[PDB]
Write a protein that binds this ligand. Structure first.
Ligand SMILES: CC(=O)SCCNC(=O)CCNC(=O)[C@H](O)C(C)(C)COP(=O)(O)OP(=O)(O)OC[C@H]1O[C@@H](n2cnc3c(N)ncnc32)[C@H](O)[C@@H]1OP(=O)(O)O
Lengths: 328, 430, 73, 64
């Protein structure tokens, strides 16, 4: 398989589609649209499905700029994929453009990295420069977190009583044999100390050589938050929640202000487990109690609820049916 | 007009005496100060000029504090965060005979819908007044429980972003000592929302990350990773595990060793859990934020006023000259204007003095001299601004006619009615 | 012609407020909301719709049957 | 309004001509306004506008 028939299964196990099926659903939803509206207007003869939709994938180059690429699906090296789709619809027989953005739930599940944030920002900037709608399909698990794995594997504990660890410990340290081969990478800051006659490097700040797990993800997240706040005021913004959304993934959705939510999904800021740990008892049993449709649809964060992703893409096209092709 | 300045009685070269602690504290104690706990008089200084802090909307949304104050005679708007637990009393409606008054417990360092709404309102009001904004950020994130998601916390979290993106004055975010910013609280006040005006600073005793250490441990340090760590640390576990993996011992010995290993694995969990939490905390430090470039600098609390005075003043003075530049050529962007000012400074002072830019005091004095001095050295910066203005006007005339040649013969004639004879000779001969 | 629509409900409606599981002494409640009256939720909803349909670029058809705002405590 | 705005290569939309007239008048007023407020650039705007004119226009420029 090696891709494309192993990621689809993982996506299906979570109650959502694979990301690279978003275009096919899109085409099929357009077909339904041409039929559904046929009772409302004297529409011209529809186009063939092969001529109903043409689209190009937006990928990042080595500098941070977009490239309109034609490539086989599944070639994504990051957890975000975006497209420019041109199509014909009943209200727009010749020309209608959108920028579609989506998370890949199967790449390092959900979570936003610096490159995902950069692609989001560039695709949104393209949408604003063109003045065309932005569509965001959210299936994420928040920002990206991580530890410095080498240090986690090569640290030692300075105990108060090495024969009884319940008398506590004083600090965490590296030995020189292991310090000398990591500190050159600016992965860790340590202070030399002498303890029991031994030279130890007590760790004071851990940085990590891996990129995409540190505070740089906050800088990215807030950055794209601003973009969404801008896009609402320039272009049309619509959001579809297929699996779940955590943290920034929910604010982006909220900053779109036009939310379609699939059944058995949840928009949360904190999970049930963390709340049950703070409160001291099993208060909540499911995340759907916290950000489910019984909460989001009745408090007005969610404009519409649907049963599956295909109906969601249909609802997107239905709302787009009422609105101009562009801000101009 | 610009924000008014006072010749304050409270110095700029003093230190802040009150130090934020790890235990709960009233945020006003760090803004205005407090009486000495051991004396009958004796005021312990805070951040702002004594007597200057003035609150608004006190009994509403008590988890966040907002007000106005002065720094060195410079008026500022102030936002700070309650760390203590507050109790919100909800009254009963007499229209319902079966209604009851309730008390809701609200923990500190947390957004609630009401506290987010208050923060938004304060930001909008202070920006529209024309003031710079000082934010003292100690938010652990948003409430995610059933009630607060039902009570629409996401909406006001988003309104915070919508507010900050539209600020036109300096916005200085500072993370005090023994304070943290976690995740959802970053993405709403990050400096990348409005880079032209927002700047973020951290103390040495501050923290910033996506999740708290415990939440990160709960994901990245499961039971099995704790056991893998025990495998290379605990002498007892190491002895037992090396013995159990030794071939050709016996069946009963292997069974006893395995049971002892299970007992040690479960016994040692609390200590290695605390170790994992410390390991997680070691990557939430401001040195990492400085190396990654998400804060502008790392400040010591005690001298912070002296920093923030001279920074703020400079920015205000820059905001004047940049504005004039923007008036000379409204087509320029902000980076062009910053580089232009850089170049003008180095050109007029000399390259040996080019290092005197990232020095808030010396450059603020220089900018003050160039902007406020008249009938004197005559402000070479002013002449440069005049030249930029002249070039813009000329470019606009040529741009306007080049797009519309059909009016050219009417624009020439009018411009030959207010010129000297020699200029008319130049017009005819050339 | 695409338009935005806002209309007013004249029947009396029942708002079910669920209980927070974190408070063992909480109870779910029923609130009667009368027709032809503004309430904060409905005023916010109307504001949100107006802002959205404006930013979409659509004209707004409002069908107004409001007797005023609820002034209770 | 539909006949005046959507029809082209036909009656030729007299309102379109009126809009073009308002536009040209505005452009001219802005040129004269910009130079009137800042005379210091006038001699530089003259020369550039003598580079893309017919010889009869140049004669009008010199004689008038
Ligand atoms: C966005 C902001 O502003 S901050 C908010 C940050 N987001 C979060 O709080 C993350 C939420 N944490 C969670 O894990 C969520 O509760 C859920 C829904 C993903 C939990 O789902 P689970 O079925 O428990 O997934 P699980 O915990 O097995 O995670 C799978 C793996 O991916 C990794 N992972 C999971 N979530 C994340 C994340 N948000 N970021 C980075 N890595 C992650 C873990 O290391 C985990 O390790 P494993 O490979 O050994 O399993």
């Amino acid at each position: 398989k090696d891709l494309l028939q192993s990621k689809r299964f993982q996506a299906q196990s979570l109650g959502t589609t694979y990301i690279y099926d978003i275009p096919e659903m899109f085409r099929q939803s357009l077909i339904k649209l041409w039929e559904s509206m046929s009772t409302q207007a004297f529409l011209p003869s529809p186009p063939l499905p092969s001529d109903m939709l043409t689209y190009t994938e937006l990928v990042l180059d080595d500098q941070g700029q977009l490239v309109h690429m034609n490539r086989l699906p599944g070639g994504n090296e990051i957890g975000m994929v975006a497209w420019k789709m041109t199509f014909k619809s009943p209200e727009y027989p010749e020309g209608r453009d959108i920028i579609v953005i989506g998370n890949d739930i199967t790449y390092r599940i959900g979570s936003f990295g610096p490159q995902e944030d950069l692609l989001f920002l560039r695709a949104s900037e393209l949408a604003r420069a063109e003045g065309i709608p932005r569509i965001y399909v959210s299936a994420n698990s928040g920002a990206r977190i991580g530890l410095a794995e080498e240090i986690r594997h090569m640290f030692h504990v300075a105990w108060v009583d090495p024969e009884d660890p319940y008398k506590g410990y004083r600090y965490l340290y590296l030995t020189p044999q292991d310090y000398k081969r990591v500190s050159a990478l600016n992965s860790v800051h340590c202070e030399h100390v002498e303890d029991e006659g031994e030279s130890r490097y007590k760790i004071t700040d851990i940085i990590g050589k891996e990129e995409g797990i540190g505070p740089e993800n906050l800088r990215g997240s807030g950055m794209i938050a601003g973009e969404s706040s801008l896009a609402y005021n320039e272009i049309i913004t619509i959001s579809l929640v297929t699996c779940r959304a955590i943290g920034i993934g929910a604010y982006l959705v909220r900053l779109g202000q036009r939310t379609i939510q699939v059944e058995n999904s949840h928009l949360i800021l904190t999970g049930a487990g963390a709340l049950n740990k703070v409160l001291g008892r099993e208060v909540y049993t499911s995340n759907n109690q916290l950000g489910g449709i019984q909460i989001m649809h009745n408090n007005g964060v969610t404009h519409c609820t649907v049963c599956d992703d295909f109906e969601g893409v249909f609802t997107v096209l239905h709302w787009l049916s009422y609105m101009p092709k562009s801000v101009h | 007009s610009s924000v008014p300045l006072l010749n304050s009685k409270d110095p700029i070269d003093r230190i802040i005496e009150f130090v934020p602690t790890k235990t709960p504290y009233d945020p006003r104690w760090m803004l205005a100060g407090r009486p000495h706990p051991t004396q009958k008089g004796q005021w312990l200084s805070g951040f702002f000029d004594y007597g200057s802090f003035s609150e608004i909307m006190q009994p509403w949304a008590q988890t966040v504090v907002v007000g106005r104050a002065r720094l060195g005679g410079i008026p500022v708007g102030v936002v700070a965060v309650e760390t203590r637990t507050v109790e919100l009393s909800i009254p009963a409606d007499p229209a319902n005979l079966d209604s009851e008054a309730k008390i809701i417990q609200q923990a500190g360092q947390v957004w609630f819908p009401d506290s987010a709404f208050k923060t938004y309102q304060a930001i909008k009001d202070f920006n529209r007044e024309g003031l710079p904004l000082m934010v003292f950020a100690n938010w652990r994130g948003f409430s995610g429980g059933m009630k607060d998601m039902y009570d629409q916390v996401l909406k006001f979290g988003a309104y915070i972003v919508d507010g900050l993106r539209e600020c036109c004055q300096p916005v200085l975010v500072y993370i005090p000592p023994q304070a943290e910013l976690r995740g959802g609280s970053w993405v709403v006040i990050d400096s990348s929302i409005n880079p032209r005006h927002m700047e973020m600073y951290a103390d040495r005793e501050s923290r910033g990350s996506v999740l708290e250490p415990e939440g990160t441990v709960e994901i990245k340090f499961r039971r099995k990773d704790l056991v893998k760590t025990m495998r290379r640390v605990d002498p007892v576990y190491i002895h037992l595990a090396e013995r159990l993996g030794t071939p050709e011992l016996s069946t009963a010995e292997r069974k006893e060793l395995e049971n002892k290993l299970k007992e040690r694995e479960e016994f040692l969990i609390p200590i290695y859990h605390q170790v994992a939490v410390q390991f997680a905390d070691l990557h939430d430090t401001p040195g990492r934020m400085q190396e990654k470039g998400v804060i502008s600098d790392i400040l010591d609390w005690k001298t912070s006023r002296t920093f923030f005075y001279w920074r703020l003043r400079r920015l205000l003075l820059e905001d004047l000259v940049k504005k004039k530049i923007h008036n000379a050529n409204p087509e320029l962007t902000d980076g062009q204007i910053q580089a232009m000012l850089r170049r003008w400074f180095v050109e007029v002072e000399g390259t040996v003095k080019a290092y005197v830019w990232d020095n808030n005091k010396d450059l603020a004095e220089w900018l003050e001299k160039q902007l406020t001095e008249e009938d004197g050295v005559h402000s070479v910066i002013e002449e440069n601004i005049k030249c930029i203005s002249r070039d813009y006007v000329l470019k606009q005339i040529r741009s306007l006619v080049q797009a519309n040649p059909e009016v050219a013969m009417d624009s020439i004639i009018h411009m030959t009615q207010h010129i000297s004879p020699t200029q008319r000779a130049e017009v005819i001969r050339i």
